[PDB]
Subunit: 392 residues, 4 copies
């Protein structure tokens, strides 16, 4: 059936494979069989992944202490700490996830029955499209990163170095992927597993935004179903019972949104802060020159993908607010004689109450917030180009 | 009759002559005969104009690559890309324009009948005044640009160059209007058509704002008619039927505004971003010195015209919001016994719902927004004068 | 009687003596005898004062052109242009002032009758206190300016100049009050009248804010009377007629506020822009050193007086909003059985409608606006100290 | 019983011992026996403490005049002036405190009776936890400050000075605690009392925020009791009398909040300004280097404690707003047939009226305000790092 759990679990399982949101029974179609247990195989795999990412973080910290902590090299520590924070926040989210899934299944039951109808693109297809787009873009970004790494390595070896170095996979690992073998003894297995850990770190960084997108789409699906139900009575006379049902379903959707926001406030805050910091860093670094054209294509692809992913997360989150507001226009056109207390309550609720995901209530994810964030980014970049100027 | 189509089509036809909003039957007084067809003479003329503007853009890009992309010379690429984006956005707007015109004619029918009355300046005269002012100011700006070009050319030739150059139209085209003849062979016909293309580019840049102004005036006309209808019952006892009619007409006007905003969101966003960028650029360039007094007059006229055009676009767009709010003051004075549910609904709708054009819902074009934009411009200029300081 | 005209005309007459708001019959106690006529003795005196101030402005412009227009010496042109703009705006305000006074007298009639009561400080005493404080502070500022001028002159003559200059009033006028005698022939009468013109310019600069303060106090007086009337029924059962009367009086006060705001939008905008510019200029200049202690005391007194006058104008204007909001708290405590449609309308009106003076609707003069302006001033000063740093 | 006075007086007495909020009978359990009398032993002790702090302030001012007032050394004058302002504001607060305590006891009486119930952590335990955490953190900060002082003294004496100085308590007082013995003759009693005065100054600086936290917790306690009472009727049919009682209690709580805000506006403004200034100063100073690791730990502990204390004050104040808003979600789920005028009034009151502490109405202490303050701090730091850059 068209349920959020059945539409989200195919990618929740892949995140479990990348050790995110440790749970048992996440592959089962029954939403009541998923539970969080500290003694589980997914718990052990995510514990191993956390240990590996922490080893990466300590190696980066040691390297930066040896070299010197600046505003440029600190981005590695920020990225690794953000991955660790994502791991911890996802552990807590998986702890809270049984109740979240249960309430999501309970409140979404009436939305699978008439007069609500499935749109041209059901929740499964929407989540699949969003997740496939995000996964493909992240895989392409990592592919261009690796390709640029190998190519910069080869052009750094074949000329501009007077040779004196046999091109090998070992030297690749010890040079491009240094600062980790200084603490650990070298081994091809060790190097390949470090590669897998870095890939999983990038995948977790992308999956934070992917999970936010999927949750926002799941909420906007039901909100759009409610909006379509309201629209389907545009030129027809509506009884008080229909308005009572619409108001009750809207109230239940608001309750579910509040519960999901309380559960995901930490994840939303972490994702927003991380995305803002990395967008500012990349916009600061946009003006420098790169040694090879492949580096230019990779860097511009990465910057465009990061900006687009942040904007798409914000727009998908604001889709909830826009969908809740869209019913107001149709409700404002209700005929005079078919106007009752229920319609007044519903209109007051949509007009006055803000209905959107929030970063621990500090801000509400809306299109207004996206425009304000864009302006703040512009101002921060204008200020930081003063710092950037003496370098060039 | 006093219709928006009959008041806007004289300038829509001129934009068609400058290859903007490609449509057929735009000169006919019947709003139902205008349609968008990809195989049409206006489509061919706008395709030629797009090809010419793209040739201009590629020539500018090649010249800037040869010289070097900085923050100063990039304004040419921004202008040409904005012209291209205006062409594309106007193509999509003309695609959506049949439905927009149809709904505009349908909802505005009751506003040509009593108790609504034509003001001292009908929609035709208002649109004519706005369009004539904009066209005359743009023609004057281009006239002073050309006059400053010829004069700077002559004073650059007659002294400060030791002659060694015969004053000719060919050298004018190859020197002031360079960077295009490097890719294309020289020809007087080629030079004159490039001149016409540049003039059309400037006219399109101005006509984006002109079209926004005309649409805003068309909406504010009906909103002011509604406001006057509300005012005409200040000290008279009003039945529920009159309030029902006023609320229904206000709701229909809000529907039309929402439809027009959905159609014109791309145009509004492009115009706002372009105007903000060019205003910031000109305010950054205001402090430098110019070689001749005619250059000073031309530059100050251009800066004043750009600032005034942006402010006038924003004020004309905010006129919709102000006109919708103006009826609240009269409605708040409704007598106690003649207060019903319809008046309460109408007051709640005007007070709570924001009624204005939006840039894809990211911001609402209001006087508050104009003041905020002025403050943002002041802050951006204060930051960018740090960059400007080392030059002088 | 306690009327705004009878409480404001003693200072309106003094402004007439300083050639501000040209009117006839402004000294008469009848509000219907004041009218604006272009052929009048006050019109002639204000025309002479405008000619003199324009002569001052042209002399300053010529001096700055001879020396060089910078960001430091431009403050004189800004001050003189602000005085000229104040003259023109006050001419238009006096043109509109007959209707403003008539409507003010008409709507304020019920406020001089029960159940409204005169507070411990009537409107006459409040306006007198505000005007006397402003006039005394401005006279003290001018007195310290003149004292610092004479003292800096004497210490510049008696030492640090090797004498070679006989101390005289003529040399004072030609040195401290230069840039005006370069265009006009010297004469003791000419010098003394230029002194009087400068004093009148300073008095007009202060009287703009003084007039805004007086208007704000006049409106807040009636709003506080309404608030006290609402408060006087805290623990008593209120009939619908009393609430009808309160709502009607509040609506009439809102109408009067809207009319006064429409009349005084230009004055409010000019005063706010001028005060912001001068506050920013003085906060930029606060860090430099002064040659003598008397100069330090004068400059700090001037800066403190300017900041306090701007803050007091903003607070007096926001007193209208605070007074309108203060009745909401008492109305929210109305007993359940004595709650009717009138109370609901009144509460909705005060809660939703903003009730304050506006700068042509671009912003509303509230305490929130004062805090935002303080933050904007802090940001602007932080940015401009970058410009100020290389000087020291 | 669970009363605010009985839960706050144990720490009010300690503040009295540190000479804050001078009152008599503050240790008595009866809220009506506390009164402010200018002729009292606590008045004499706080007068002595004010004289001592003023002596400290004058000594700091003399030292800075001898050395030179910069943006770095001025922090001592800011701290001492903030302590003096805290003393004066707390004197006025103790003057107003009889009425505040009386109204707090009067309005909180119904909250100690059914259907209101004591939560798992009563007001006494909440206030005790908050005050103990603040006192322990401040004592730890002072302990690390003193430890860093002694250690920096010893390492400055034992090496890097070529000895030539016998390590003694007298030299400690004359070197680390200089600028005060230049005006006063040296004495071990004088030095130890100056130490006690500095400790009391730090304790007053922390107790301003502590008192704000305690007041915010006291208000949020009753607001959370009201929210729980509203929640306890989620799936039960509610009569009009229960809603009348809930609305009346909410109105009384709003009245108490308004009274407390009027009494504590000066304290809130002073605390917010002081915290903002010191947070900006510390974030500006975060990038410099420190001579010893103990200095690093002390400075980072102080910065983290200051940031956390400011954030916790703001969050505790915003807890009132969040608690008032939390009842809206439950009230929005009231069944259709059990919806009456009282519920509509209550929902309108919570939705439209902002319910939070304010800094003299210039701003409202909410989570939105905390996020805005964080953004403002980020912007100010970005601007001020321009000033900080030439030092390093």
């Amino acid at each position: 059936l068209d349920l959020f759990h059945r539409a989200v679990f195919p990618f929740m399982f892949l995140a479990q494979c990348v050790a995110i949101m440790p749970l048992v029974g996440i592959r089962e179609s029954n939403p009541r069989r998923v539970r969080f247990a500290y003694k589980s195989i997914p718990m052990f795999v995510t514990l191993i992944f956390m240990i590996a990412t922490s080893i990466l973080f300590l190696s980066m910290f040691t390297h930066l202490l040896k070299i010197g902590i600046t505003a440029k090299n600190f981005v590695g520590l920020v990225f690794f700490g953000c991955v660790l924070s994502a791991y911890v926040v996802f552990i807590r989210l998986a702890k809270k996830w049984p109740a979240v899934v249960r309430i999501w299944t309970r409140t979404e039951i009436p939305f699978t029955k008439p007069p609500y109808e499935i749109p041209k693109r059901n929740l499964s297809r929407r989540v699949q499209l969003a997740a496939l787009a995000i996964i493909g873009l992240s895989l392409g970004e990592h592919a261009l990163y690796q390709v640029s790494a190998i190519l910069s390595y080869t052009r750094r070896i074949q000329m501009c170095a007077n040779i004196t170095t046999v091109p090998s996979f070992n030297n690749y690992m010890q040079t491009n992927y240094d600062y980790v073998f200084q603490l650990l003894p070298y081994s091809p297995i060790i190097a390949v597993l470090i590669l897998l850990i870095n890939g999983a770190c990038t995948f977790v960084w992308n999956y934070m935004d992917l999970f936010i997108m999927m949750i926002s789409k799941g909420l906007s699906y039901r909100f759009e179903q409610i909006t379509t139900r309201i629209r389907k009575l545009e030129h027809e006379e509506v009884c008080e019972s229909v308005f009572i049902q619409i108001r009750e379903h809207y109230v239940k959707m608001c309750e579910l949104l509040e519960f999901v926001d309380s559960a995901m406030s930490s994840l939303i805050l972490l994702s927003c802060v991380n995305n803002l910091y990395f967008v500012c860093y990349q916009l600061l670094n946009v003006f420098n020159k790169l040694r090879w054209p492949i580096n230019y294509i990779y860097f511009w692809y990465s910057l465009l993908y990061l900006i687009g992913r942040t904007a798409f997360v914000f727009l998908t989150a604001a889709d909830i607010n826009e969908e809740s507001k869209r019913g107001l226009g149709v409700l404002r056109r209700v005929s005079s004689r078919s106007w009752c207390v229920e319609v007044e309550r519903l209109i007051f609720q949509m007009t006055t109450q803000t209905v959107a995901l929030s970063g621990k209530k500090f801000y509400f994810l809306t299109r207004r917030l996206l425009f304000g964030m864009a302006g703040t980014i512009v101002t921060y970049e204008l200020v930081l180009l003063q710092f950037d100027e003496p370098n060039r």
